[PDB]
Amino acid sequence: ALYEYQPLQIETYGPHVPELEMLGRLGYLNHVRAASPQDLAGGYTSSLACHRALQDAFSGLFWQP
Amino acid sequence: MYHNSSQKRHWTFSSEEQLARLRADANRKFRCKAVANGDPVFLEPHEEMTLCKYYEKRLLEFCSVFKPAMPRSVVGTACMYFKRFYLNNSVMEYHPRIIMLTCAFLACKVDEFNVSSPQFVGNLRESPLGQEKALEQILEYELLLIQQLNFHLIVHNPYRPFEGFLIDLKTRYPILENPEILRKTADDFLNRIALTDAYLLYTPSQIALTAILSSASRAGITMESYLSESLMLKENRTCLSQLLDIMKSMRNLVKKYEPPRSEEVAVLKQKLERCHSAE
Amino acid sequence: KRYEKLDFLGEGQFATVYKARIVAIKKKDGINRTALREIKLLQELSHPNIIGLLDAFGHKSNISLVFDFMETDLEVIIKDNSLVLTPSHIKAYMLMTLQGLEYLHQHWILHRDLKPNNLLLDENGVLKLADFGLAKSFGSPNRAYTHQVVTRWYRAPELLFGARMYGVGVDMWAVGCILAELLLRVPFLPGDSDLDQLTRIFETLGTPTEEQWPDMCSLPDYVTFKSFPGIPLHHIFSAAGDDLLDLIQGLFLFNPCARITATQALKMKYFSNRPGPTPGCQLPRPNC
Ligand SMILES: *[C@H](CC(=O)Nc1ccc(C(=O)Nc2cccc(Nc3ncc(Cl)c(-c4c[nH]c5ccccc45)n3)c2)cc1)CN(C)C
């Protein structure tokens, strides 16, 4: 009767988006504005904006009505 | 997200012919209502299209000079509201002058661009009494606009997908030495794409990618390897061909767009004002 | 309209709710921005642990929103002294809350009003996040957010320090508070003002140093506090196992980046350890 984690499987109809923690190690973060110390203090990192932008760029790219 | 959005589910249509059927149904239904209540006074669907294009340009002009500066997302949301509303409604029943302002008002609310109503109507080039009347009309039509959008208010625009594609190009496509020089021209194409029915026919990501590839082709840069290699389309050939055909169709939509003509617009505006004066 | 009024459910700070046929109806600036926020967000979301919007109607500038009728809320469960909350029940509530939050955060939306009364429970024991009148999209650098969000007893320390930009931590912290309220049956940090809220947080958990919160002093409303040593979590929650204490510590990390996300919380051993979460049909019901 135990619980096992299963990741959300939502079809994006587009190219795979690199994982959030991967972005910095993959060079993406070199192309977004660095988060200010206040932003980091609140928990806002440039990785979030980069990930959202990539997800929106790839969302539904392969989908046809 | 777009991939499970109301926009994808309900406001992305299969072809231009479907949009034509919707608009013709709206025009015919208004004609039937007018006949049942009560001649060349009625506008033809193509005249309705010319008027809708004219007033969409008017909405763009209104948003461009709006103070405080309207974010591009709000402008795109308002234009999408306008297109969707006049998919299923006639300009002869609801005047596009008021409807476009209601679109801008509702879009400002939806996209969390907090603007007071008096400073919203202060942007209108009208007298204070005229601004008050326009505000009253906008408030009357806000709920009508929301109902005619079927309570689907989130609009996915191509601007963030465009930014994400630029990030991806800078990261994974070094052959394009500086993707930023593609921006301006691509943005130009985006504007042209926004003038057509493409926003009702293609995904925001497809529109952004079409703009970027069109800008690249304009500069003599070929980025087919970006699609085939980086976007993993060498592993799925039918997907690559389908995306290429979607982009070609969008480019064709831009190519065959015809801006409204001033004399025809004046004649149609006279006809529209005659329609609204009566009934 | 097409719904007949059957009972008066209650009121909030923005609208009045009534039970109708079952559904629940929530009733110069135009249509209220809170109602529009709820409409625009709930129309784009479909998850079993997120309240489902069924309709909307109104006239002129007035509007009513229709939702599924939710039998009760977590606040009622917590306050019912006749109700016993076993570890399994707590695990079930926490699991459903975190699954809804994982879905919500995946779609780049912060609830920003998480609290037991905003976690509704139906007759089948399915928890649903509700009251999206404060919810907002995040991940956009150009959008500026106010720090007033979240009720004070559940407000994260970064918000109390005036953070304009923030992420999922503001929800997760509230989740932690909710978890604490599930474990103690009373509000964890019942401050009466922002300063007293920060004081209660620091007296219970300790004053965070630079190591625990690298950019703390840069927040616009940051004020230096007396160094409190805090109270060890096993002292506060004497009946909590090691896995549950690990989850609590992760949820109450002062650094919002280090604070565990909903996905990270769901993967923790506490949820996969014995005993398993209570099936929704077996969750306790506050009979009068
Ligand atoms: C004996 C039997 C008994 O126990 N009867 C009983 C107890 C308790 C309730 C109850 O909680 N009803 C209720 C009150 C308020 C709200 C709701 N559900 C609901 N559903 C959808 C939505 Cl969107 C909301 C909501 C969201 N935001 C809100 C703000 C304010 C109010 C609601 C709200 N709420 C259910 C019912 C029956 C008892 N006697 C002694 C015999």
Answer yes or no: do A52 and C165 touch at CB < 8 A: no
The letter for the amino acid at C243 is D
Answer yes or no: do B117 and C28 touch at CB < 8 A: yes
- C36: closest CA of chain B, how far (Å): 7
* Number of neighbouring beta carbons within 10 Å of residue C27: 15
Nearest residue of A to residue C137, measured between CA atoms: A52
- Separation CA C1–CA C64 (nearest Å): 11
Instruction: Output the CA–CA distances (angstroms, integers) from residue C33 to A60, B66, B106, in the order listed.
Output: 30, 21, 10
Best mutation target, B153, B156, B157, to test chain C (most C CBs within 10 A): B153
The letter for the amino acid at C272 is S
The closest CB to that of B232, out of A15, A55, A56, belongs to A15
* Number of neighbouring beta carbons within 10 Å of residue C246: 16
Prior bond to A65 cis, omega within 30?
Answer: no
Note whether residue A50 is domain-resident: yes
Residue ranges in C185-241 assigned as alpha helix (H): 194-205, 233-236
**CA angle in degrees (0–180, nearest 5) for C84-C86-C88:** 145
> Strand, coil or helix: what is C123?
coil
DSSP 8-state assignment for residue B4: G
- Contacting chains of B (3 CB pairs or more, <8 Å) are A, C
The letter for the amino acid at B83 is K
Annotated catalytic, C55?
no
Q: Which of C7, C55, C113, C192 is catalytic?
A: C113
Query: CA nearest A23: which of A13, A35, A41?
Result: A35
Its CATH class, for the domain covering C72-282, is mainly alpha
> Strand, coil or helix: what is B221?
coil
Best mutation target, A9, A29, A50, A61, to test chain B (most B CBs within 10 A): A61
- Separation CA A35–CA C141 (nearest Å): 9
Note whether residue A4 is domain-resident: no
B105 in reach of chain C (CB within 8 A): yes
C277 in reach of chain A (CB within 8 A): yes
- Does C95 contact ligand 1 (Cβ within 6 A)? no
- Separation CA B62–CA B27 (nearest Å): 27
In chain B, the domains with their CATH numbers are: 3-155+259-278 (1.10.472.10), 159-257 (1.10.472.10)
Residues in CB range of B223: below 8 A, 6 or more apart: B169, B173, B175, B176, B212, B213, B216
- Separation CA C9–CA C19 (nearest Å): 6
Q: Are C63 and C70 in contact (CB under 8 A)?
A: no
- Tell me the domain boundaries of chain C: 4-68, 72-282
Pocket test for ligand 1, best of C14, C53, C70 (most atoms within 8 A of CB): C70
- Does C288 contact ligand 1 (Cβ within 6 A)? yes
The letter for the amino acid at C181 is E
**CA angle in degrees (0–180, nearest 5) for B251-B252-B256:** 120
Instruction: Output the CA–CA distances (angstroms, integers) from residue C58 to C1, C65, C121, in the order listed.
Output: 9, 9, 27
- Separation CA B228–CA C279 (nearest Å): 48
Query: CA nearest B216: which of B183, B249, B263?
Result: B183
- Separation CA B262–CA A63 (nearest Å): 38
Answer yes or no: do B3 and A64 touch at CB < 8 A: no
Bridge-partner residues for C18, per DSSP?
C8, C25
- A41: closest CA of chain C, how far (Å): 5
- Per DSSP, which regions of chain A are E strands? none
Bridge-partner residues for C137, per DSSP?
C109
Q: HSE (CB half, 13 Å, CA atoms) of B63?
A: 26
Nearest residue of C to residue B141, measured between CA atoms: C60
A16 in reach of chain C (CB within 8 A): no
Note whether residue A13 is domain-resident: no
The closest CB to that of A64, out of B4, B208, B242, belongs to B242
Answer yes or no: do C63 and B143 touch at CB < 8 A: yes
* Number of neighbouring beta carbons within 10 Å of residue B106: 25
Nearest residue of B to residue C43, measured between CA atoms: B152
Atom of ligand 1 nearest to the CA of C285: 4
What's the domain range around A41?
20-58
* Number of neighbouring beta carbons within 10 Å of residue B227: 20
The letter for the amino acid at C121 is L
Note whether residue A38 is domain-resident: yes
Residues in CB range of B80: below 8 A, 6 or more apart: B11, B155, B157, B199
Note whether residue A31 is domain-resident: yes
* Phi, psi torsion values for C256, nearest 5 degrees: -65, -35
Query: CA nearest A58: which of A1, A8, A14, A7?
Result: A14
H or E segment at C104? Answer: helix C87-106
Note whether residue A49 is domain-resident: yes
Polymer length in residues for chain B: 279
How many structural domains are present in chain A?
A: 1
Contacts with C274 from chain A: Cβ below 8 Å: 2
The letter for the amino acid at B252 is N
DSSP 8-state assignment for residue B199: G
- Tokens 């169709």 locate to B249
B160 in reach of chain A (CB within 8 A): yes
Superfamily covering domain C4-68: Phosphorylase Kinase; domain 1 (3.30.200.20)
C95 in reach of chain B (CB within 8 A): no
Note whether residue A7 is domain-resident: no
Q: Are B207 and A64 in contact (CB under 8 A)?
A: no
Residue B235 buriedness (CB in 10 A; 0-12 / 13-18 / 19+): exposed
B1 in reach of chain C (CB within 8 A): yes
- Separation CA A65–CA A44 (nearest Å): 36
Bridge-partner residues for C10, per DSSP?
C17
- Separation CA C44–CA B159 (nearest Å): 19
* Phi, psi torsion values for C99, nearest 5 degrees: -65, -45
> Strand, coil or helix: what is B88?
coil
